[PDB]
Design a protein around this ligand. Structure first.
Ligand SMILES: [Cl-]
Ligand SMILES: [Cl-]
Ligand code: NA
Ligand code: NA
Length: 129
């Protein structure tokens, strides 16, 4: 599924991401835009052999099991394919564990380089929330 901007904002708000660990909703929408272009089916392979999955590009070396990242962990206790569903519940629940692990949203390289320190509230401007 390819979300619309305000559609994803409302879905994320309903799943408890607005101001989760201090990060306003605009941060999460900005991160999804540049990680996946709002596409739940996005995948990308990394040089170390791991793969990133879904709307928030969650990485298989630490967070999900895909059966082909030897020596990796599965800290969210889910198959990586669950992160590609049109239902974002699994992605959101895993993202809450990632952002709580000490490094905040710096875990998402595109957020660090393209959202951090910008006017992120612009990403939810005009949406009915
Ligand atoms: Cl915001
Ligand atoms: Cl933080
Ligand atoms: Na914070
Ligand atoms: Na893994």
């Amino acid at each position: 599924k390819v979300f619309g901007r305000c559609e994803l904002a409302a879905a994320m708000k309903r799943h408890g991401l607005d101001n989760y660990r201090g990060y306003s909703l605009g941060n999460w929408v900005c991160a999804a835009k540049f990680e996946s272009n709002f596409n739940t089916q996005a995948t990308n392979r990394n040089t170390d052999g791991s793969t990133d999955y879904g709307i928030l590009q969650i990485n298989s070396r630490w967070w999900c099991n895909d059966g082909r990242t030897p020596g990796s962990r599965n800290l969210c206790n889910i198959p990586c394919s669950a992160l590609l569903s049109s239902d974002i519940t699994a992605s959101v629940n895993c993202a809450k564990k990632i952002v709580s692990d000490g490094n905040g949203m710096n875990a998402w390289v595109a957020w660090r380089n393209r959202c951090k320190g910008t006017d992120v509230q612009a990403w939810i401007r005009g949406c009915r929330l």
